From Swiss-Prot, chain A:
Name of the protein in question: Capsid decoration protein
Entry's Gene Ontology cellular component terms: host cell cytoplasm; viral capsid, decoration
Keyword annotations: Capsid decoration protein, Capsid protein, Host cytoplasm, Late protein, Viral capsid assembly, Viral release from host cell, Virion
Family designation: Belongs to the lambda phage gpD family.
Region (Disordered): 1-26
Comp. bias intervals (Polar residues): 1-16
Subcellular location per the Swiss-Prot or TrEMBL entry: Virion; Host cytoplasm
Subunit description: Homotrimer. Interacts with major capsid protein.
Taxonomic lineage from the root: Viruses, Duplodnaviria, Heunggongvirae, Uroviricota, Caudoviricetes
Keyword Cytoplasm attached: no
GO annotation (BP), single: viral DNA genome packaging
Summary of the function given for this chain in its UniProt record: Stabilizes the expansion of the capsid head shell after genome packaging. The packaging of viral genome in the procapsid triggers a dramatic reconfiguration of the capsid shell, expanding from roughly 50nm to 60nm while the capsid thickness decreases. 415 capsid decoration protein molecules cooperatively bind the expanded capsid, thereby stabilizing the mature capsid shell.
Transcription regulation in keyword set: no
Species whose genome carries this gene: Escherichia phage lambda (Bacteriophage lambda)
Curated annotation (Swiss-Prot), chains B, D, E, F, H, I, J:
Pfam families attached to this UniProt entry: gpW
Protein name as annotated: Head completion protein
Keywords of the record: Late protein, Viral capsid assembly, Viral release from host cell, Virion
Main location: virion
The UniProt record lists the keyword Aminoacyl-tRNA synthetase: no
Localization per record: Virion
One GO term of the biological process aspect: viral life cycle
Similarity remark: Belongs to the lambda phage gpW family.
Quaternary structure and partners: Monomer in solution, assembles into hexamers on the prohead. May bind FII and portal protein (Potential).
InterPro entries per record: GpW (IPR004174), GpW_sf (IPR036626)
Function: Plays a role in morphogenesis of the virion head after genome packaging. Presumably interacts with the portal vertex to stabilize the packaged DNA within the head after packaging. Probably binds to the head-tail connector protein FII.
Origin species: Escherichia phage lambda (Bacteriophage lambda)
GO cellular component, one term: virion component
Keyword Cell division: no
Swiss-Prot record, chains C, G:
Complexes and interactors: May bind head-to-tail joining protein W and protein U.
Gene this protein is translated from: FII
Coiled-coil features, chain-numbered ranges: none
Pfam families attached to this UniProt entry: Phage_attach
Species, as recorded: Escherichia phage lambda (Bacteriophage lambda)
One example of a Gene Ontology biological process annotation: virion assembly
Identification of the protein by name: Head-tail connector protein FII
Keyword ATP-binding part of the UniProt annotation: no
One of the record's GO cellular component terms: virion component
Its biological purpose: Plays a role in virion assembly by joining the head and the tail at the last step of morphogenesis. Six FII proteins probably bind protein W that closes the DNA-filled capsid, as well as the U tail terminator protein of the pre-assembled tail.
Keyword line: Host cytoplasm, Late protein, Viral capsid assembly, Viral release from host cell, Virion
InterPro entries registered for this protein in UniProt: Phage_Head-Tail_Connect_sf, Phage_tail_attach_FII
Length: 108, 67, 114, 67, 67, 67, 114, 67, 67, 67
């Protein structure tokens, strides 16, 4: 009977968080705020495996799935490490921290 | 199973428009036929299925005004 | 295509009735060897009595296939109706868009020509 | 037992709409016709079946207005 | 003796709606047919036969208002 | 001879409503058909005879108002 | 199941006519042994004079049941319709979803297989 | 594939307008027939498919006035 | 490729007006029926095609008024 | 070809009025028919083709009034 009203602070910086849309090829239910990379073969949008290095392109903005033809994702901004739906393949924290280096997306 | 439904319904619409909605077939003792729909209701059925399925947006919201 | 104004409609009707009526029969042997065609198969019942009682009640299979896909079909070669196999006994002349293939059962009896 | 009949009615709606609502069937000496209906009645029937079945939301209670 | 009546009425409604109310059946030398009933009247009969039975309510009285 | 009339009328009403009222019957040289009657007037007739006979109470005398 | 879009309709037609017409009879003897199947039994007249007057007025019973249960029916086995007794003597080829059954009366005459 | 069926529908419209939209064709027990349409719906279908495809401008946006 | 269409449509209208727009053709086993059009839509098609094609001046706009 | 077209059309109109607008021609084995047209539309078509043709005066400009 102890309800905790935790405040929601997804982003972690003052930089703007722009969005973008693109057709996606998610094979599983993808919750929002999830890293994703462009497919190598089909050049479609799929959730980041956590093993490819630097292939990740952005953070999913709204929930989608296989049925969703296209989807919207964050293309700019900075978020926090805790509230990112990292894939279970990603083991060490440092590579996750540096994963979005070189893009308009940063993590803290 | 909505995209192929849309494709089949749209193809049926187009062939009915042009020439190719066969109603009756007869084989001298082995004959059948099908009921026919209407152009307007078929069109609205097409519109309903496409708007309910995940294809691209086809209609916006009202219309703004300004001087 | 052809100076008819009517055979075009005939061919379209034939294609439609093939699509909506009949099954897919695949051919074996012959110059066509293996090929798949769509045709409406029927098998009327015929009986002969010959002598006192010689009831030999049988069937007269017909397929009504388009001539274009069965050009130079010959007669010696066989045919298969899915799981079942037949052999073309005769071919009717085309009526304008197709003809009738009349079939016998089993294996064709020899050749007996030379 | 609402899901199977809902699916059957939806498939029948699509089939009737496109080309295949066969009314009469005749093999030699054996004719039989199944009576046909309109499409508005079929659509309202499938809608009411879906809404009475424990399916997802399809309707919203009016619509408020704010400034 | 009304539960099976409701079941028969519902089944007839369903089959008539989709594809399966045969209006005429013909055998060589033996043909019969049945008069066709409108869908709205069948729905009226369904509703009245269901409500007159002791089964649970599908209907409630008029709704009031309050600020 | 009124209760059996009522029962026969109700049974015929149900038969007509579902699928059963045979319009015509054809045998070899036997074409016999009966004219159909509308469900609305059939219902009016059965209700009239039911309230005419010694059946139980169905109708009520208007409705008064009170604060 | 049916690769025609029309054989499903014909199967519905045949089941409908068998349900709204005809009767159900119990197969006797044969590999089916005890079983019940519903068909549409008719029986026209047949007259033969043989000599000058040897009129042998009889009947030509037919059943016309569907093809599914009529398989492995053979010929020597009998069949009882309602209270009467008959026996199959000829089976028509499948017309697509059914076939006619011709019924003699009483006991089939011998076998005379070999 | 837009211009292909655009041209097909235009040709079908021209045929129907002129003389030889085949309503039905039969030859010795081989009878088929195709459902017919209306010129109004065919023309509006032509117009809407033309708008959907990349054909040049045919209609414009109102017209202002000036003294 | 519109002028020949115009000529064909004008000839078709002329023969249809006079005596020569054939509906059915029967040759002891082969029959062809052609859909029946009207006159209003036909002349509307004539007018629209002639105004769209390279046909010369035939139509003028409003009117002036003076004393 | 205006003159002979007009003559043929007028003769056909007169024949239709009198006795010989043949709807169908049937010889055993060969049956054909031509479409049937109205009379007022034919008359107005005759009038408009006449006024298009360089024939004599047929119309006048409104009407004048004077005390």
């Amino acid at each position: 009977s102890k309800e905790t009203f935790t405040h929601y602070q997804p982003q972690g910086n003052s930089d703007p968080a722009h969005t973008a849309t693109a057709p996606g090829g998610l094979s599983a239910k993808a919750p929002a705020m999830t890293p994703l990379m462009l497919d190598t073969s089909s050049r479609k949008l799929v959730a980041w495996d956590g093993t490819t290095d630097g292939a990740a392109v952005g953070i999913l903005a709204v929930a989608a799935d296989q049925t969703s033809t296209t989807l919207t994702f964050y293309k700019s901004g900075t978020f926090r490490y805790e509230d990112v739906l990292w894939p279970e393949a990603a083991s060490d924290e440092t590579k996750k921290r540096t994963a979005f280096a070189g893009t308009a997306i940063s993590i803290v | 199973t909505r995209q192929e439904e849309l494709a089949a319904a749209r193809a049926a619409l187009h062939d009915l428009m042009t020439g190719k909605r066969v109603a009756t077939v007869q084989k001298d003792g082995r004959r059948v036929e099908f009921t026919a729909t209407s152009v307007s209701d078929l069109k609205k059925y097409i519109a309903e299925l496409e708007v309910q399925t995940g294809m691209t947006q086809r209609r916006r919201g009202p219309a703004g005004f300004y001087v | 295509d052809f100076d008819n104004l009517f055979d075009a409609a005939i061919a379209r009707a034939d294609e439609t009735i093939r699509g909506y009526m009949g099954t897919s029969a695949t051919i074996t042997s012959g110059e066509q060897s293996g090929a798949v065609i769509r045709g409406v198969f029927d098998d009327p019942e015929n009986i002969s009595y010959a002598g006192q009682g010689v009831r030999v009640e049988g069937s007269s299979p017909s397929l009504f296939v388009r001539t274009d896909e069965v050009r130079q079909l010959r007669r010696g070669d066989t045919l298969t109706i899915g799981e079942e196999n037949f052999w073309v006994d005769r071919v009717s002349p085309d009526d304008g868009g197709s003809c009738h293939l009349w079939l016998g059962r089993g294996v064709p009896p020899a050749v007996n020509r030379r």
